Amino acid sequence: QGGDPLVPIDETVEPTFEDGSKEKTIPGQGTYTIVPDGTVTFTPDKQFVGKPDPVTVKRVDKNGTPVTATYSPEFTKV
């Protein structure tokens, strides 16, 4: 999940967020950034006590496993 070291993410497949988004910056929540090079930065913040914006990050690796991050109002003081 997130970014498997033993399973390099495939740079020719679709790395996106579930909504089809490319970056989601919410103040305090972090930034998830994908660039067309096929590389994505999953940068979450589990120190953000508040209300994160509901977004699911989804990129598939070489095998095709979607490494995801699911942010929702539950994932605050966790």
Which residues, 6 or more positions from 31, have their beta carbon under 8 angstroms from its beta carbon?
23, 24, 25, 41, 43
In angstroms, rounded to a whole number, what is the distance separating the alpha carbons of residues 22 and 77? 26
Neighbour count for residue 7 (Cβ, 10 Å) = 12
Residue 5 neighbours by CB distance under 10 Å? 6
Tokens, residue 49: 């006590």
> Phi and psi (nearest 5°) for 61?
-85, -170
Pairing of strands 23-26, 30-35: antiparallel
DSSP class of 26: E
Query: Domain range for residue 28?
Result: 1-78
Experimental method: NMR
Residue 67's SS3 state is strand
Q: From start to end of 1-78, where are the E strands?
A: 15-17, 23-26, 30-35, 39-44, 55-60, 66-71
Question: How many domains does the chain fold into?
Answer: 1
